[PDB]
């Protein structure tokens, strides 16, 4: 749709301000190294010369710590046991995998927590016997709230010597919530307590993994065909190479940029150059993408080696230009879950506009609540709700035959592409703000909003919108491939 030279110029500008802003972030991090070390105790390693890591991130440091401790070995064991079952006798593979999942859950959490998962699953199963979608949703919500209660938190903390084990239990149960809620809703020979235990205690996605729809699990696990061992080895080698590359990139961004430390000390964030501000925003979202690439590629890798078909991994968030697009592609598993359940049952967009505005509102309320329900999560979800609704309304208005005919009459398609990118610039300028509010908390979002739009209304806003305009042109040009079909 565009002359090659124009697209090349847009792409060069896009990579230009990404790398320039990263350079600004790197310089700022270098300048304040001593203060951050004395404040947030930057870690030390020999991975990259004399650089000192910034482990103020919680998910990354936590998951890497565990991966070293136990999870990597247990995943290797799961791989070995899966291959052994497939070779000796595949007829009993599902139950062998279930037993291995129970044993691994016991090893990393002991009986206190395997019992908790079993109790949650059993209660969900019994409630499912009543066969009422409302009952199942209420049971899942109440179980999640119990996970969020205080006395429950204290009793759980009592059992575990190290807090990290308690947080692992919290994440495991937060995801079991979705897994057994999915199964219970589907229930409302295939559906028996043995199958539900097989699904819940599936080790690859036990702790924090892509939400694997029960349909795929039952269909492919019950399958009677598999690839050769040589193909499995080749896939394992390639997947492990890609995972190592992704982990190396995550470590590179952790070392070069102290983005997390800069976001922890709000006073610094409010006195840096605006180029550094945009660089910090982009570095934050890109580090999050790499983190949920590394963490979601290991379960995905294992399930690929088991013959399962996992949800597609997130697509680089430097080519995402919309609330709906990156709600569809970044988190594929959760998106499929939220569409099939949660959204459709309430009514969705097939019954009146109010129906759409309430189905989307309820979906986003549940999504915010699931992540934990803190205040900043509610703000991020409200921002996303407004963005998604506004975008859907604009798309509907454009799709009207009169509007389409007028646009064709007046604006050339080459021109209408420029208008599309111009709108995408604002949409993305709010897409990054919502993500910043989700990551750094309300204060970071307020600092960005004051510094960029209000305090810099004359020219800073225009500069940001122009750079996001080039960004949107590149993003739409790339996304023209997959989005169409």
């Amino acid at each position: 749709m565009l002359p090659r030279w124009e697209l090349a110029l847009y792409l060069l500008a896009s990579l230009g301000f990404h790398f320039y802003s990263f350079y600004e972030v790197y310089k700022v991090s270098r300048e304040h190294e001593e203060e951050l070390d004395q404040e947030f105790e930057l870690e030390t390693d020999t991975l990259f010369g004399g650089l000192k890591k910034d482990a103020t991130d919680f998910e990354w440091s936590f998951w890497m710590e565990w991966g070293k401790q136990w999870l990597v070995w247990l995943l290797l064991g799961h791989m070995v046991v899966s291959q052994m079952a497939t070779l000796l006798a595949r007829k009993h593979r599902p139950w062998i995998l279930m037993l291995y999942g129970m044993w691994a859950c016991w090893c990393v959490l002991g009986t206190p927590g395997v019992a908790m998962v079993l109790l949650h699953t059993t209660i969900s199963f019994c409630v499912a016997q009543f066969r009422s979608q409302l009952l199942t949703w209420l049971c899942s919500l109440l179980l999640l709230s119990t996970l969020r209660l205080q006395g429950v938190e204290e009793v759980k903390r009592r059992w575990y010597k190290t807090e990290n084990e308690y947080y692992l239990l919290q994440f495991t149960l937060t995801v079991r919530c979705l897994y057994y809620t999915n199964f219970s809703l589907e229930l409302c020979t295939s559906y028996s307590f043995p199958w539900m235990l097989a699904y819940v205690f599936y080790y690859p996605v036990l702790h924090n993994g892509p939400i694997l729809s029960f349909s795929e699990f039952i269909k492919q696990m019950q399958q009677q065909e598999h690839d050769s061992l040589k193909a499995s080895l080749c896939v394992l080698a390639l997947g492990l190479g890609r995972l190592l590359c992704w982990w190396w990139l995550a470590e590179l961004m952790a070392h070069l940029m102290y983005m997390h430390a800069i976001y922890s000390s709000i006073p610094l964030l409010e006195t840096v150059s605006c180029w550094t501000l945009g660089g910090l925003a982009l570095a934050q979202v890109l580090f999050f993408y790499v983190k949920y690439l590394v963490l979601f590629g290991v379960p995905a890798l294992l399930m690929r080696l088991d013959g399962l078909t996992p949800p597609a991994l997130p697509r680089c968030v430097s080519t995402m230009f919309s609330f709906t697009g990156m709600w569809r592609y970044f988190d594929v598993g959760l998106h499929n879950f939220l569409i099939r359940y949660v959204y459709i049952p309430v009514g969705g967009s097939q019954h009146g506009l109010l129906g759409t505005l309430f189905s989307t509102a309820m979906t986003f309320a549940f999504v915010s609540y699931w992540h934990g329900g803190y205040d900043y999560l509610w703000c991020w979800a409200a921002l996303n709700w407004l963005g998604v609704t506004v975008e859907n309304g604009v798309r509907r208005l454009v799709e009207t035959p009169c509007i389409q005919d007028s646009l064709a009459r007046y604006f050339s398609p080459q021109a209408r592409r420029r208008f599309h990118a111009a709108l995408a610039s604002c949409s993305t300028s709010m897409l990054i703000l919502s993500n910043l509010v989700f990551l750094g908390g309300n204060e970071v979002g307020k600092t960005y909003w004051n510094r960029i739009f209000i305090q810099g209304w004359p020219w800073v806003t225009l500069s940001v919108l122009g750079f996001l305009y080039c960004y949107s042109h590149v993003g739409i040009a790339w996304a023209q491939t997959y989005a169409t079909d």
Partner: nanobody, 104 residues
Framework: KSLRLSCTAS????????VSWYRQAPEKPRELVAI???????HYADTVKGRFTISRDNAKKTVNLQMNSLKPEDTAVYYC??????????????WGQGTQVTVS
């Protein structure tokens, strides 16, 4: 005279916690009194605005609530609460033990 409360975290990176001060009068739910975030931003409950001052010092990892012009209602149990804000920092949340405050 006036009473000065405190909440001194230990073994924690206190530069990021958004400490708070919840008070629970008997036969009533726990209610927010004063919250001080990690950027210095301060917020107060409507009933106790101006009279109450909340301050913090990251150097010593301490918080301090200054209650002035006490009234018979203020008698309650005051709970600290050190919770983070942001998906990078995580789901940290450490309610304090709590302490008793009484007048008349």
């Amino acid at each position: 005279k006036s009473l000065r409360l405190s909440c001194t975290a230990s073994g924690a990176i206190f530069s990021t916690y958004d400490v708070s001060w919840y008070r629970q009068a008997p036969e009533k739910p726990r209610e927010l009194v004063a919250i001080i975030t990690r950027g210095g931003n301060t917020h107060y409950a409507d009933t106790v605005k101006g009279r109450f001052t909340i301050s913090r010092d990251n150097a010593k990892k301490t918080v301090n609530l200054q209650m002035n012009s006490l009234k018979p209602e203020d008698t309650a149990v005051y709970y600290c609460h050190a919770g983070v804000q942001g998906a990078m920092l995580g789901p940290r949340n450490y309610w304090g033990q709590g302490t008793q405050v009484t007048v008349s």
